[PDB]
């Protein structure tokens, strides 16, 4: 509630709960290694 940022990107997609753990910096997996890639120093929030 108390910060300012230049831009905020909201990405959405539909996956299974097994692959939810793959959404995290530095992870590997089918979704991670073919569908959606995160930076090592990622700053943000993950909601599912």
């Amino acid at each position, epitope marked *: 509630n108390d910060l300012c940022f230049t831009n905020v990107y909201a990405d959405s997609f539909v996956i299974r709960g097994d692959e939810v753990r793959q959404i995290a910096p530095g992870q*590997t997996g*089918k979704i991670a*290694d*073919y569908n959606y890639k995160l930076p090592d120093d990622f700053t943000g929030c993950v909601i599912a």
Partner: antibody, heavy 117, light 108 residues
Framework: EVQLVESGGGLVQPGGSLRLSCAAS????????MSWVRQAPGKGLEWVSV???????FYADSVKGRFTISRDNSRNTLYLQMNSLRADDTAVYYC???????????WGQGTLVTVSS | EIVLTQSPGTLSLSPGERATLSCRAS??????LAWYQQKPGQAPRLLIY???SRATGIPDRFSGSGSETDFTLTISRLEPEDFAVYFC?????????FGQGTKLEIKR
């Protein structure tokens, strides 16, 4: 048609090391998911590891940091090294390819691995 | 780790009839099993895609059946070429596992 030809394996005393290899007749290996599994008698198959088409790897928990996997795209050959071979792991190991979510479709002739003092 | 159970312990039957291979898992899944054949001393061969999709190199006599946790394999009109052992492996996630095997015998 598509064939996998392996070699290697064998017997070394506990604490030893062993590298294995396998080549493919027609499937290039480079653009394919490749995996390793082993069979111990009266105990069955067992997962070991696999390589994804993106070059990433993963292994079973019991062998993490111990069992290694590599490829040579130039020769359509699969390379596996094993270190810290332990007891009761003596078995036949196989090379395998998938389509979809790890459907081991084509299989090699299998390679025996043995460990004992 | 999810464990499978193949049943029965052994299969003994005459050719030309129907085969029934049942399998159970520890934890309930949805169409995440398959079948693997092996004539002894040979290369194991992939049988059935998912619960009921058959590979192209495999004749029509085979049929697979699956559920949440119970899964059964069915083959009809048994033939001599069919004498072998039969295995279940999980194409779901855990990471993947397998079953204990079951042997088919052709009776004259």
């Amino acid at each position: 048609e598509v064939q996998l030809v392996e070699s290697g394996g064998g017997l070394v005393q506990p604490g030893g090391s062993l590298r294995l290899s396998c080549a493919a007749s027609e499937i290039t290996v480079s653009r394919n998911y490749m995996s390793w599994v082993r069979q111990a008698p009266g105990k069955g198959l067992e997962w070991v590891s696999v390589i994804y088409s993106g070059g990433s790897t993963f292994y079973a928990d019991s062998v993490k940091g111990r069992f290694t996997i590599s490829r040579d795209n130039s020769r359509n050959t699969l390379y596996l090294q094993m270190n810290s071979l332990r007891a009761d792991d003596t078995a036949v190991y196989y090379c395998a390819r998938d389509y979809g979510d790890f459907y081991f479709d084509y299989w090699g002739q299998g390679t025996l691995v043995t460990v004992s003092s | 780790e999810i464990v499978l159970t193949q049943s029965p312990g052994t299969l003994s039957l005459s050719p030309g009839e129907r085969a029934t291979l049942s399998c159970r898992a520890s934890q309930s899944i949805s169409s995440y099993l398959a079948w693997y054949q092996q004539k002894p001393g040979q290369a194991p061969r992939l049988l059935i895609y998912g619960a009921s999709s058959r590979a192209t190199g495999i004749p029509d006599r085979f049929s697979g059946s699956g559920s949440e946790t119970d899964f059964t394999l069915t083959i009809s009109r048994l033939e001599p070429e069919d004498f072998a052992v039969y295995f279940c492996q999980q194409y779901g996630s855990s990471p993947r596992t397998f079953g204990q095997g079951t042997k088919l015998e052709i009776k004259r």
